[PDB]
């Protein structure tokens, strides 16, 4: 049963959308999608959704 976005969020860090029967990952504003097309990288400090450490 469990395929694409229903299989572990399609390996995406954040948003997973199925386009043309393939996983497409994307990220909240303030993050950029890594070259692997899965990981979300913060563009600057205090990215949304992260507890602050400093």
């Amino acid at each position: 049963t469990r395929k694409l976005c229903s299989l572990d969020n399609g390996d995406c860090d954040q948003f997973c959308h199925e386009e043309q029967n393939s996983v497409v990952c994307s990220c909240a504003r303030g993050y950029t999608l890594a070259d692997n097309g899965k990981a979300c990288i913060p563009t600057g400090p205090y990215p949304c959704g992260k507890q602050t450490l400093e």
Binding site: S6, Q14, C16, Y46, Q51, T52
Partner: protein, 232 residues
């Protein structure tokens, strides 16, 4: 917040507090960006003039910054008779400076949030509200993990109509709920160490009563509205 625990340093940095002319908190909010706060529409009738405070974990001591509101954007379908569409966006006069304990919560995409965040086991609610139904407001910012509750079980539990713009979270009998003074505040859902806005503290029949749950505005129903609100 009834039950749960203290937000420890930096754990709840999207929390905002609406403060009256007497400098007292009457409602919560969620920081969405340096200029915008998310809150409940019903919180706009709980004071005339009010300001927004951020970065405060302990109200009795001293991160903290007070911001004046430039624009109040209330959803035009909200009414006290139903509590439906209980959502409002605030534009601040000056931008919030992000720092320790002050940072925004992410807005998710609708479909993903509904299939992946709202199907997680729990969300986290936070605020400076009362620590039990008839007590006083908390001087400390607190948070609580609240299980998502099945729509049906919730509709059966409620004495009022749960619209599609609302969802339920909390416990049937356990003494853990949001309460008075928490309204307007954050419900967020964690996914891989990133926290997304999922709800707005809206209403309940008391606080932590048996057979009763917390009712939250369903943020996923309002993402386009929010997006629009934030562009002007």
């Amino acid at each position: 917040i009834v039950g749960g625990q203290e937000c420890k340093d930096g754990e709840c940095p999207w929390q905002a507090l609406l403060i009256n002319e007497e400098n007292e908190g009457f409602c919560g909010g969620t920081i969405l960006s340096e200029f915008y706060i998310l809150t409940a529409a019903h919180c706009l009738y709980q004071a005339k003039r009010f300001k927004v405070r951020v970065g405060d974990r302990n109200t009795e001591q001293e991160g903290e910054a007070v911001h004046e509101v430039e624009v109040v954007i209330k959803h035009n379908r909200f009414t006290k008779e139903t509590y439906d569409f209980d959502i409002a966006v605030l534009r601040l006069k000056t931008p919030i400076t992000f720092r320790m304990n002050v940072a925004p919560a992410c807005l998710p995409e609708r479909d993903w949030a509904e299939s992946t965040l709202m199907t997680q086991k729990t969300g986290i609610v936070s605020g400076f509200g009362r620590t039990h139904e008839k007590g006083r407001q908390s001087t400390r910012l607190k948070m609580l993990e609240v299980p998502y509750v099945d729509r049906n079980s919730c509709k059966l539990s409620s004495s009022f109509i749960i619209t599609q713009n609302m969802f339920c979270a909390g416990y049937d009998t356990k003494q853990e709920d949001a309460c008075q003074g928490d309204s307007g505040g954050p419900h967020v859902t964690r996914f891989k160490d990133t926290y997304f806005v999922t709800g707005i503290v809206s209403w309940g029949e008391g606080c932590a009563r048996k057979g009763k749950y917390g009712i939250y505005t369903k943020v996923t129903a309002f993402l386009k509205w929010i997006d629009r609100s934030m562009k002007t």
